[PDB]
């Protein structure tokens, strides 16, 4: 299972495997970051740093505020 992070709403795509065990916060964690800079969201759906992902999702961090 890997990670893939962007900045938040910043375009980055990069397909990523999964694995078994793991968590939400490790695939950030591939980022240094349980999430610290930002809020996550999957699939469009809201989450915290412990309510996992699934699948390879990515990581967002930064300055998320959605209102440009």
């Known amino acids: 299972k890997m990670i893939k992070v962007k900045v938040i709403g910043r375009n980055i795509e ?15 964690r591939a980022v240094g970051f349980n999430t610290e800079s930002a809020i ?3 699939n469009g759906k809201v989450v915290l740093e412990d309510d996992e992902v699934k699948d390879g999702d990515f990581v967002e961090v930064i300055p998320v505020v959605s209102g440009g």
């Open 14 to 28: 990069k397909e990523i495997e999964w694995r078994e065990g793991m968590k939400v916060r490790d695939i950030l």
């Open 40 to 42: 996550a969201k999957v």
